[PDB]
From a paper:
Here, the biochemical investigation and crystal structure of the full-length five-domain GH92 α-1,2-mannosidase from Neobacillus novalis (NnGH92) with manno­imidazole bound in the active site and an additional mannoimidazole bound to the N-terminal CBM32 are reported. NnGH92 only crystallized in the presence of ManI, suggesting that the ligand binding improved the structure stability, leading to the formation of high-quality crystals. There are two independent monomers in the asymmetric unit. In chain B, there were only very poor fragments of density for the N-terminal CBM32 domain, and residues 79–227 are missing from the model. At the N-terminus there is the start of an all-β-sheet domain reminiscent of a CBM and termed ‘CBM-like’, which is made up of residues 42–77 and 259–395. A CBM32 (residues 86–222) is inserted into a loop of the CBM-like domain. These are followed by the catalytic domain (residues 408–1166), the C-terminal CBM32 (residues 1182–1316) and a four-helix bundle domain (FHB; residues 1321–1411). The rest of the description will focus on the better ordered chain A. The catalytic domain was traced without any breaks and its fold, as expected, was very similar to that of Bt3990, with an r.m.s.d. of 2.01 Å over 712 equivalent Cα atoms reflecting the moderate sequence identity (41.6%). The reaction mechanism of GH92 enzymes, with catalysis occurring with inversion of the anomeric configuration, requires two residues: an acid to assist the departure of the leaving group and a base to enhance the nucleophilic attack of water. The catalytic residues, the Brønsted acid Glu944 (Glu533 in Bt3990) and the Brønsted base Asp1058 (Asp644 in Bt3990), are conserved. The specificity of the α-1,2-mannosidase Bt3990 is primarily driven by three residues at the +1 subsite: the His584-Glu585 pair of residues forming hydrogen bonds to O3 and O4 of the MSM mannose and Trp88 providing a hydrophobic interaction.
Here, we report the biochemical characterization and the crystal structure of the full-length multi-domain GH92 α-mannosidase from Neobacillus novalis (NnGH92), a bacterium identified in agricultural soils. All known family GH92 members are Ca2+-dependent exo-α-mannosidases that perform the hydrolysis of terminal non­reducing mannose residues with inversion of the anomeric configuration. All known structures of GH92 α-mannosidase catalytic domains have a highly conserved two-subdomain composition, a N-terminal β-sandwich and a C-terminal (α/α)6-barrel, with both subdomains contributing to a pocket-like active site with distinctive −1 and +1 sugar-binding subsites. In contrast to B. thetaiota­omicron, which produces GH92 α-mannosidases as solely catalytic domains, NnGH92 has five domains.
Author numbering: 41 to 1411
Write the structure that this text describes.
Amino acid sequence: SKTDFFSSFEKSDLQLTWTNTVETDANGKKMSSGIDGNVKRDLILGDITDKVVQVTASANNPPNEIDSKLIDGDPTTKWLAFEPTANIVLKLAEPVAVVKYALTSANDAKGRDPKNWTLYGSLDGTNWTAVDTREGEDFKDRFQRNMYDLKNTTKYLYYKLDITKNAGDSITQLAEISLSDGIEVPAPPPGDMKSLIGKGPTSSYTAKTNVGWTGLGALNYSGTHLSDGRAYSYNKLYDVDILVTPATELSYFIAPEFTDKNHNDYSSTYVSVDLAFSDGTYLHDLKAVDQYGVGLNPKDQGDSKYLYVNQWNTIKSTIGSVAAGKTIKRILVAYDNPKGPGAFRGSIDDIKIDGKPVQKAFGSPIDYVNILRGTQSNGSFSRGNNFPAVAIPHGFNFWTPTTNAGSSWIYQYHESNSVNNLPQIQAFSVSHEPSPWMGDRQTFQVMPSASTAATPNANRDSRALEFNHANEIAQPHYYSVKFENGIRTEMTPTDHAAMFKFTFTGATSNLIFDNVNNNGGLTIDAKSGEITGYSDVKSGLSTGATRLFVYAAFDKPVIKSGKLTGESRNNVTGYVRFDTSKDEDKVVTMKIATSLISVEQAKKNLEQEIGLNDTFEGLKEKAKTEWNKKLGIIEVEGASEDQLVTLYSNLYRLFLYPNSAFENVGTTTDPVYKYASPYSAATGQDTATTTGAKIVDGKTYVNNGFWDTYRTAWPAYSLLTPTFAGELIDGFVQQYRDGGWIARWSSPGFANLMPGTSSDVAFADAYLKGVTNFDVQSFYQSAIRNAEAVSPNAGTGRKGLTTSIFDGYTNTSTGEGLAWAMDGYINDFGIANLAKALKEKGDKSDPYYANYAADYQYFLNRAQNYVHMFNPSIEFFNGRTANGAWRSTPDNFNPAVWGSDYTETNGWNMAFHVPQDGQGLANLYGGKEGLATKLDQFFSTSETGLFPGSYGGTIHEMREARDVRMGMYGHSNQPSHHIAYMYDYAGQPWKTQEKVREALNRLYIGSAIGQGYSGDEDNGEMSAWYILSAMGFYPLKMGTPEYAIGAPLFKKATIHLENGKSIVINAPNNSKENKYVQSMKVNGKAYAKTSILHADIANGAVIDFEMGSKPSKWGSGDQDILQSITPGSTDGTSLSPLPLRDVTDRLIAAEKGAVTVSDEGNGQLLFDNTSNTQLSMKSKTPSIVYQFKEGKQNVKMYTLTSSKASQNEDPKSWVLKGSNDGKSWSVLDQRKNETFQWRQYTRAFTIQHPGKYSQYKLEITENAGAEVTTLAELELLGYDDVTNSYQAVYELMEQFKQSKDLTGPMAVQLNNSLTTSLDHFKKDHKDQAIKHLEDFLKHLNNKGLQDRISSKAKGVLSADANQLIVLLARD
Ligand SMILES: OC[C@@H]1[C@@H](O)[C@H](O)[C@H](O)c2nccn21
Ligand SMILES: OC[C@@H]1[C@@H](O)[C@H](O)[C@H](O)c2nccn21
Ligand SMILES: [Ca+2]
Ligand SMILES: [Ca+2]
Ligand SMILES: [Ca+2]
Ligand SMILES: [Ca+2]
Ligand SMILES: [Ca+2]
């Protein structure tokens, strides 16, 4: 007998042996329980409709208004045909004598209702006996059901409703048909689970509905799970005789569907293909496993959560492993689910059994790369939302097929398939799209055509050419498609150019040129066989995008040529025609290059990169080589095929962005680099052949949202490609030197989207890791501009800075102000560490040098300002209104609700937004244990996607987050990406290990069918998450050169570093299940810590993980956790310490402070916490005095914010003085010859001789030249009196004495030591105050006294004492 079997459930395939039929056991008992297959419906007397197994109408209106809709029991779904007449054929399971039927009219357009019809009956389906005629029928209402009786005792297997006249329209429609046999059943029995050949998915996020995976047919299953507990049904499909061999693979495609309004019932995933063997055993009893390791049985399919609902899923199982030598007697479909009630529905297509499968071979990393990942994905549900980008790493152009030539939605894997269910290309495009949301720009289009008409038609629909994915090769360096009609197109990239081979079958062959829309030009010089063009195409968010120029040449004479018309694209549509009658002329080659400078430059770009000697194959090899140099930085052992696809495709995505936007205007020997600026104003107007944009010397790179890429991609560069990273960074620093700012979202200029200015942290982070090959000085300037200087541009700097730099938080007056705020504090963390590093560098030629020290202090403080956005009443980060009040209170708050404060997520997902200081974050939650409790709750509460909040309706990010099914964890999007690693701060690293492994395992699947990710990939970010996590470490603390340890994915990984050394990562015992770190070594030596320095791996290292299947305590020690700014000893403090703040804040209004100016101006404008108010003081030489009415203030720093007015009015030299009486002043700080290069720009100064004073005076000794002196704001940055903290501890100690948590000599000794400490503090004896607090701690740990304190009390009092020491040390 045979070893192979295949069904696509087509017309041409074998029909099912049984339909809707349950398999029976050895005893003849149905293998089903608690199931109802019947569709829910309004039943008529003797309703028989459930025996209809097939309905076929003469014409249809796919995707939604097809014959299928006639028996689905929903009046809301209809069949429609664009015809005045038609016939519907109903095939029944068994012959029945129909004696009654009902038609139901549809939703609208009464004229389309049937009016005259005949019902026929048949035995064979070709010879028809009339059984009822109706004429002149009327349906008064929409959704109206008419009932019809007839005499008939003849059992028939087919019924035809022949609709001979409708109600006058040229279109016909009907919502529902029901048939009846006239026999009463007062109690309709449950029917068997449905299993029948149908049209495929009735709903799908990402695929074409009502077609198969391939072809027009599939197997459809559905039913109702009635039971509270287990329900199942194993149904037989096909009678076969198939011998299984050791190598036999079973594969299939399954598309489970949601049957509920809420898209929360996952029942449809509890399904698999099953086999009945001749020996009386079933595949579901053997330990067959899929490509993910999941049992190939229904229960394990559903429990393991690898099947996505409303999407197609590829499944593959080597049943040979477990069933070699058995014979398959029947193929089954099985549903089996432990819990309900619920309901399910889905499709299976392409059940294949292959006795001798051929495995794919791979010669090098690039052979693993599928550039189609992220294309069975759209705006309803993303599996990456990429496009098939062919390019060199970081190339100047992308090249790509498009199935939608008007759109930034460039290529659909399945969604836009033809009536024959094949994809259609409409063009090959030059592209610069960073994402579909940002949109495409600078595009240009060609399409081959075998048209013989006088003129090739340039209409998108009519020129489109169908193809099969099996005939398409899609790689970074090579794309190839063979179309159904015999044409082949192949392309390969250069940096600025590309080569295409068009191979034809006919005598007359054409290339059609076109564009996304009419905003460009085409010039065809037929005589020299050249194309010339320009493109102004640019999406809404393509801010600063300039004109692109195109040049192209052919290897064959062009015989006919010209402009085309009729598409409303007359500026861009034309063609060239070639004589390809002779065999050696059947392939035509086009060489094509692009420029943002000029047509002349496009020409020069082409000559530089495609010499006369270059061939298609030579260029392809050059591109393959450039990709392998990137892909082969990482080499792993033990990986499956699926893992290597994911790994190497991830590395491709990582290096696809960002992109060169500069050109070589000199020669290959002597390069001269220049770019057209999307950053500053155009020099002048464009011409057809030359750009008007400013031509700027040097390099630049583009296409990057820092809100995405800072998390993973940028640190990936700094680790994997240190040297190139610096060239990339400098190309972004260029944006500062040119346009004044570094882009927040470069697309290619300053596009306005997403919160934060994370170039700050990304580039700071890179520098501190030893990527020093860029203009750090300018970078720094751009960072402080982001951090200190209000932006006039919508697309640059930090929104809400007007108030936020003074308030310590960003208020709800800025959209998603919380989001701006939290990312602000992380950026400040990086700016601060860089300032420290530049201080230590000591470059005295840096004009800014004297200022680094101060900036470190000020910025490290700002990094801790997260406290100002932590709402203590709900224990979540939360917005504040302008007046200071929390947005939410316990009564109204819901952490499940998306939006408002929370960009593209909910409060849950922003609960942990403090990667720069985990201990500080833990403290807000009560300590490490409190942090862990919060995370646990996060990971065990399911995201339902039902809470859109401010988004109004469902956005795709919500569906994706829902389908992660890791509690609330939104791995589908960037703002959650740090969360799994936060367990390293809580001292539970095993939970990080668990979550990271689930993420790597389940959320990067489906590559083979154009899926591959759990949501939008975003310019390398989702990819680098996987690459870094799989190595076993992760840059959690962006802005400081070290990683948090997770666990490696592979038995071995090597990172070949550019300096010739290796990072080897050994985990010989690694496996799907062995996910937990048991112990760890670095360089032969046992390693205890869950952090590792970049400086320890960058010069090579050997890392050994002992992996096992059970959690361990490795890395849970108090000094083994990730360290923070906040000391570990403070864990669990009852105090709420603050970093530097402006101690004048809010005093004036509460009358606890006031201000006087030497000229009697309103000095309140200098302390109102807004740079939108300034004071002009009528003197070159004014004085401001701030008076604290409630005692001495410990001020460490102060800030001056330049005004909006001219720079000449600025302070320039000054003295800050302190006093206690107002008569006698001490000199605290002196500055000379200061400047404020920007407007509304804050500068911070470290007071040379600080102390505690009740009165502060700023005495301006010199200004910048004008007759007046103007400022916007002043601040006195200091700390609260430590005394108030001591007080809070006495208070707490009293609470414990009253509860008897603290008694006897322990109470007394603690009291004494604290009091002696306090007394020393008040006499300015800092060292002695600390020493007595150390005594306090010794008491707490006195062995003789443990029966006098509870653990609760000992714990918090310890933490408090240590917190006090910290408060003291900084005082
Ligand atoms: O083109 C027919 C379409 C229908 O498919 C749709 O259901 C609706 O009834 C309608 N109103 C006007 C036109 N149409
Ligand atoms: O594509 C640009 C931005 C991204 O940078 C970001 O990841 C965000 O999730 C998003 N959703 C739609 C568009 N975008
Ligand atoms: Ca099929
Ligand atoms: Ca219907
Ligand atoms: Ca995103
Ligand atoms: Ca203030
Ligand atoms: Ca002000």
